[PDB]
Design a binder for this molecule. Structure first.
Ligand SMILES: Cc1cc2nc3c(=O)[nH]c(=O)nc-3n(C[C@H](O)[C@H](O)[C@H](O)COP(=O)(O)OP(=O)(O)OC[C@H]3O[C@@H](n4cnc5c(N)ncnc54)[C@H](O)[C@@H]3O)c2cc1C
Length: 496
């Protein structure tokens, strides 16, 4: 089905049945359109150049901003992806807090001039898993999707776009896909597809880079997330606690290089650590405290719109995380308009992949339950609990593979529970790369980079076997992962 071992059966599956809609982009937006369109009867296909969420949808600060109602919808439909937590906004010269109280919330805050603060609740999500769960739900309802399929050229007929040309980045082959409507939800790449349609006119895009560093909690012991100012600068910064770590706020610099390879520079790092130390003088945050980091590209219109060409291509310059749903409904409104569909948007009711029927409230009982069910399979109750939180109701699936592969796992010298996450990833999360698993299905590259160092050998060895990789594939797929691991910590690591 949605496995990375059936790609050929999935390529010739959408290049056979004529598609009503084909969307370019596996971002939160592409997945968003894919799901909505699919749940209205518009048979949709989706093509993602690299990995689902591999673009900017995996490089945000991961905050679902509150819009208030929309933030709920998201939470209730997938409580394991988003979780509300407290945010602490210090004050210098909802709950209104004075100085002593503020210091009591975060006893690490700068004392000098602290007048107080306000603490409120904010929903923290998993941009990559969110993107994915929308994808999995879309596919589950009839949508066909493929990562590592790159649209390199458009197909026209009587002046109109009727299909794309996609190159399978994993096998290097090319294919043709036809669709009644073609949406371009390519994020910061939108204009490239607009050039391949020769319609990049008027309002074009200008890119802006932002970076996040990640230090270990022991070295930045935040009680709850804090939203603070900067010394000189003029901007604000987000220090967020997660999985025993604290990833610190964002930078803002112009960007016009390669849209697929932005990363942390020495300026970026020295800028985040600087401010962080300004706000928390107790810490002596140096370049050796950062154990990981990431860069992302944010597009801005020059001279949340939607573009229409003379060929009929629909581009989504918007690209919203917090507002992805209405954004999708709006986009599908246009598609449905064109293909003429008398079907209402009811996506705010659709639970996402792994979402509980009971919605948020029902999740505690859910973990207590899944924790006990996993234990009866001879697994650590706390371990499965954490996996339940990760995978949502889909834990059963990972608990099945994990169960079934106790022998395989031993032979491959890796914990059964980890082997379960892999088979699920390959067979039901369309994982075809080690990078897919370590950075997007688990987020380990960012939040537990030592874990990927520990298991990169054993994992590559297994995948090599699971996919019948050649020497070139095994070696390449190993350099790809090794490369990112290097860029994650070292800003001087030179490529090529
Ligand atoms: C520093 C920073 C901080 C941020 N903070 C927040 C925040 O606090 N809250 C918030 O809500 N959002 C935040 N965001 C970002 C916002 O969430 C995203 O911009 C928005 O969700 C992105 O929609 P994206 O889905 O357009 O589609 P994208 O994710 O940009 O689509 C990416 C995909 O398009 C694919 N693609 C490109 N070209 C082709 C092609 N020719 N063929 C096939 N596939 C192709 C790429 O391979 C890639 O996988 C932040 C961003 C940055 C950079």
């Amino acid at each position: 089905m949605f496995s990375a071992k059936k790609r050929d059966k999935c390529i010739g599956e959408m290049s056979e049945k004529q598609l009503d809609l084909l969307v370019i982009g596996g971002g939160i937006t592409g997945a968003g359109i894919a799901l909505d369109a699919q749940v209205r009867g518009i048979q949709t296909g989706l093509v993602e150049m690299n990995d689902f969420a591999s673009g900017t949808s995996s490089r945000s600060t991961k905050l679902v901003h509150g819009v208030g109602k929309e933030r709920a919808i998201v939470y209730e439909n997938a409580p394991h992806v988003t979780t509300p937590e407290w945010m602490l906004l210090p004050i210098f010269k909802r709950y209104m807090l004075n100085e002593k109280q503020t210091l009591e919330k975060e006893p690490l805050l700068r004392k000098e001039n602290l007048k107080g603060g306000g603490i409120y609740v904010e929903y923290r999500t998993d941009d990559a898993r969110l993107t994915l769960e929308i994808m999995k739900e879309a596919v589950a309802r009839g949508a066909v999707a493929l990562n590592y399929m790159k649209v390199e050229s458009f197909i026209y007929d009587q002046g109109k776009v009727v299909g794309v040309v996609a190159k399978d980045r994993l096998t290097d082959t090319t294919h043709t896909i036809y669709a009644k409507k073609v949406v371009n939800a390519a994020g910061p790449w939108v204009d490239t597809l607009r050039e391949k349609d020769r319609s990049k006119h008027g309002k074009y895009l200008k890119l802006s880079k932002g970076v996040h560093l990640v230090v270990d909690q022991s070295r930045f012991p935040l009680r709850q997330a804090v939203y603070f100012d900067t010394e000189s600068d003029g901007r604000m910064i987000f220090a967020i606690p997660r999985e025993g770590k604290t990833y610190i706020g964002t930078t803002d610099t112009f960007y016009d290089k390669d849209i697929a390879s932005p990363r942390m520079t020495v300026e970026d790092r020295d800028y985040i650590l600087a401010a962080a130390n300004y706000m928390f003088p107790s810490l002596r945050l140096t370049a050796d405290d950062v154990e990981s980091s990431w860069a992302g590209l944010r597009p801005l219109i020059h001279e949340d719109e939607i573009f229409f060409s003379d060929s009929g291509l629909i581009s989504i310059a918007g690209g919203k995380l917090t507002g992805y749903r209405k954004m999708a409904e709006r986009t599908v409104d246009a598609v449905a308009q064109g293909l003429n569909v008398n079907e209402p948007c009811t996506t705010a009711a659709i639970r996402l992949s792994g979402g509980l029927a009971e919605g948020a409230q029902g999740f505690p009982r859910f973990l207590d339950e899944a924790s006990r069910k996993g234990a009866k399979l001879g697994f650590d109750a706390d371990e499965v609990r954490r996996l339940a939180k990760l995978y949502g109701s889909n834990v059963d699936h990972v608990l099945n593979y994990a169960y079934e592969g106790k022998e395989e796992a031993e032979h491959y010298g890796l914990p059964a529970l980890l082997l379960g996450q892999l088979q699920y990833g390959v067979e039901q999360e369309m994982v075809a790369t080690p990078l897919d698993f370590f950075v997007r299905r688990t987020g380990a590259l960012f939040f537990n980079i030592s874990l990927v160092h520990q298991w990169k050998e054993a994992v590559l060895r297994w995948m090599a076997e699971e996919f019948s990789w050649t020497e070139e594939e095994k070696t390449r797929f190993q350099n790809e992962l090794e490369t990112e691991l290097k860029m994650a910590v070292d800003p001087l690591f030179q490529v090529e």
